[PDB]
Point group: C4
Chain length 91, copies 4
């Protein structure tokens, strides 16, 4: 479950990285950063897509990627972080 | 259920598109982009409504649209994306 | 329930409006806008508190106000918007 | 439960404060502010990490810290704010 969500999240982020570096001309690390803050809904305070293609893609990317990204975060904290802490709270 | 949430989300986004292009003078695609990043809570790092009418509308728009948009995303991932993946995980 | 959450949300937003217009010098409508986009986690793409007092207050404001604001939005969509739609879907 | 989430949230915020003030050169209060708005997903409208180290760290920080921060907010409102209000609604 966690493994599949991990892989799915990775593939989604790879797609955004390729898209923004190609269409919006961002350096790969910047494209990845933008993809991450966008899908986690944090948002970037400096960059907004400048092309209409980038704006349309971002709209679709958000609706399709948000659910998955948060599902991964949800399990990452409940089935991976909680135990390491919950069991670690046992005297 | 998903169909109704889809239509409801579309109508809400259309309202924002019309509002921002008219009152804030944004190009339709920019008004739509702003409506989407606002209701999904991602936020836009460059534009903020400049008119008091735009600020008041955005406040109301956020409170009324956020629940619906996320309800749609919630079902889009649970009743449309999960299956295509869950069933696809069957050897 | 909805009435109490409504009043509680109003009081919280009033506090932010007074704080930002006084300490950060924002026009009341701008202070209210900033309080709303901050507590709904949308964020503002132009303004960030400039004083240390404003930064500390915003940090505390976020942790204390986010839960309430979303609890209100949660009920506003489930116990006020859903019915008007759910019952409206009855032929 | 609430105490542990409180401590865990504090430690996470301390880590971000140290990281951003050291690598991104922010004043401690600004590093803390950025860490808070980033993990609560509000986002900052002015600052984005400028170094590649800062961008990579922020990406990892977001995925690891978001779940915890919201778990704390979740309990802070349900097991600390609700009662003080729920019991306060008793004539
Ligand atoms: K900005
Ligand atoms: K700017
Ligand atoms: K957000
Ligand atoms: K933002
Ligand atoms: K945001
Ligand atoms: K922003």
């Amino acid at each position: 479950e966690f493994q599949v969500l991990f892989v799915l999240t990775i593939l989604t982020l790879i797609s955004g990285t390729i898209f923004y570096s190609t269409v919006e001309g961002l350096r790969p690390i910047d494209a990845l950063y933008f993809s991450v803050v966008t899908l986690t809904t944090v948002g970037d305070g400096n960059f907004s897509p400048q092309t209409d293609f980038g704006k349309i893609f971002t709209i679709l990317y958000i609706f399709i990627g948000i659910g998955l990204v948060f599902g991964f975060i949800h399990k990452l904290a409940v089935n991976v972080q909680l135990p390491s802490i919950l069991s670690n709270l046992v005297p």
